[PDB]
From a paper:
Glycogen synthase kinase-3 (GSK-3) is a ubiquitous, multifunctional and constitutively active serine/threonine kinase, involved in numerous pathways and over one hundred different putative substrates. In humans, GSK-3 enzyme is encoded by two independent genes that regulate the expression of two diverse isoforms, namely GSK-3α and GSK-3β, with high sequence homology (~98%) in their kinase domain and substantial functional overlap. GSK-3β is a significantly networked enzyme, which regulates a plethora of physiological functions in peripheral tissues and the central nervous system (CNS), spanning from metabolism and cell cycle regulation to brain development. Accordingly, balanced GSK-3β regulation and signaling is key to human physiology but often compromised in diverse disease conditions such as diabetes, cancers, and brain disorders.
The INDZ core was previously identified as an attractive scaffold for the development of novel GSK-3β inhibitors. Through in silico and crystallographic studies, it was found to bind in the ATP binding domain of GSK-3β enzyme between the N- and C-terminal lobes. In addition, R1 and R2 substituents appended to the central core are oriented towards Arg141 in the external solvent accessible part of the binding pocket and the inner cavity in proximity of Lys85, respectively. Compounds 1–6 showed outstanding GSK-3β inhibitory activity in the nanomolar range, with derivatives 2 and 4 being the most potent of the set (IC50 = 4 and 9 nM, respectively). Interestingly, both compounds 2 and 4 carry an isopropoxypyridinyl group as R2 substituent, resulting from 3 to 5-fold more potent than the corresponding pyridinyl analogues 1 and 3, respectively. Here, the piperidine chain was solvent exposed towards Arg141, the INDZ was anchored to the hinge domain via the tridentate H-bond interaction, the pyridine formed a H-bond with the catalytic Lys85, and the isopropoxyl group faced the ribose binding site. In proximity of the ligand, a network of hydration sites was found involving residues like Ile62, Leu132, Thr138, Gln185, Asn186, and Asp200. Interestingly, MD simulations (see below) highlighted that the isopropoxyl group of 2 might be also involved in additional water-mediated interactions, justifying the boost in potency with respect to the pyridinyl analogue 1. Taking advantage of the crystal structure of 2 in complex with GSK-3β, we ran Glide Standard Precision (SP) ligand docking and Molecular Dynamics (MD) simulations to evaluate the binding mode and the stability of the new series compared to the related INDZ compounds. The calculation indicated that the INDZ core has the strongest H-bond potential in all compounds, with a very strong N-Ha donor.
Numbering used by the authors: 35 to 384
The structure:
């Protein structure tokens, strides 16, 4: 195909643009944001994703500012960004050139569902552990992703590396500064949001992660609501009716749903009989009504459900070694540095 040459600015480091050539553009996604393409870097031959968004010339793109400060093995990397012009007065596009990753958790999970099989729990551990690490990192800056779902969990199936993508809903949450409640993808939406809360925290992402974990264990979404309000009905069918205290802790803006009383369905009867007890226990501490009762991402990483990953003999099913799971920086551990003793086993220590 015809080569495109641009002058692009590196994601990290000082603003020093470089000539970049790419080719073989292919549309691979769209949304309210604009369009995402696959492309191939001419010089190195590496595939990349290019996220193209209409951007107002006189304002700053929030996703860009967030992407320029993130540097983590479980977060898709911003290689470069550049501006391109459309065929209209002041029609400017921001182009984000990101790492290409060949699969998603959604796609992998679906393969197992269609074959009427469960994803082996080793992959559930690996994928969930890496999601929680990515969340521990972004939360340490005060950034809440606000769109955790299987479709935004990229994976390389050969190395089992997971990378979080799509920071178009991400935001630095500030105590006392309101936020919109109609956020996140419905099935993964925290109950406080359904109650119209505008004063919420990063614990909304932990709820969404819990929904991902349950989905990988069940073979299908645990809370498949057909509307914003029916989402709460689905949650209630498992968790039971929230108490008045639990409702208060969710900081709701309305609660006039007039829900009939429903008993909680026991967590052990939700999943198949052979589900590991530690998976169930972890899940019960993520999917909690009271936001502050939920595990932090770092505490989730230290859960006994991930003990297999801390074993020195662990290997991937393809024979290869596990990716780097314990190379925690001081930033990643800042919420609770004493957890390093559990998070970093003897053989991984330096
Ligand atoms: C020949 O056919 C192959 C099809 N194949 C199917 C899986 C696919 C997985 N990879 C990615 O999505 C992928 N990689 N790097 C990214 C970097 C950014 C994004 C991304 C960021 N913000 C919003 C997005 O919105 C979509 C959710 C609509 C996507 C995705 C990505 C590879 C293409």
């Amino acid at each position: 195909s015809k080569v495109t040459t641009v002058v692009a600015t590196p994601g990290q480091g000082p603003d020093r643009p470089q000539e970049v050539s790419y080719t073989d553009t292919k549309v691979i996604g769209n949304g309210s944001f604009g369009v995402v393409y696959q492309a191939k870097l001419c010089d190195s031959g590496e595939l990349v994703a290019i996220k193209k968004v209409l951007q107002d010339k006189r304002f700053k793109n929030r996703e860009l500012q967030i992407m320029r400060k993130l540097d983590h093995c479980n977060i898709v990397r911003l290689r470069y960004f550049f501006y391109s012009s459309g065929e209209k007065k002041d029609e400017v596009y921001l182009n984000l050139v990101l790492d290409y990753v060949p699969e998603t958790v959604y796609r992998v999970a679906r393969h197992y569902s269609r074959a009427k099989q469960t994803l082996p729990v080793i992959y559930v551990k690996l994928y969930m552990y890496q999601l929680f690490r990515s969340l521990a990192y972004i939360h340490s800056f005060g950034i809440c992703h606000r769109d955790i779902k299987p479709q935004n969990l990229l994976l390389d199936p050969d190395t089992a590396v997971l990378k979080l993508c799509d920071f178009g809903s991400a935001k630095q949450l500030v105590r006392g500064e309101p936020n919109v409640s109609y956020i996140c993808s419905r099935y993964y939406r925290a109950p406080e949001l359904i109650f119209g809360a505008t004063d919420y925290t990063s614990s909304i992402d932990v709820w969404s992660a819990g929904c991902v974990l349950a989905e990988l264990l069940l073979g299908q979404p645990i809370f498949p609501g057909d509307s914003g309000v029916d989402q709460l009905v689905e949650i209630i069918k498992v968790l039971g009716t929230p108490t008045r205290e639990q409702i208060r802790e969710m900081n709701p803006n309305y609660t006039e749903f007039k829900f009939p009383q429903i008993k909680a369905h026991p967590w052990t009867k939700v999943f198949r009989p052979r589900t590991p007890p530690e998976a169930i226990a972890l899940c019960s501490r993520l999917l909690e009504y009271t936001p502050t009762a939920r595990l932090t991402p770092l505490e989730a990483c230290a859960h006994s459900f991930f003990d297999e990953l801390r074993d020195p003999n662990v290997k991937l099913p393809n024979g290869r070694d596990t990716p780097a799971l314990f190379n925690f920086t001081t930033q990643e551990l800042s919420s609770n540095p004493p957890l390093a003793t559990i998070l970093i086993p003897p053989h991984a220590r330096i």
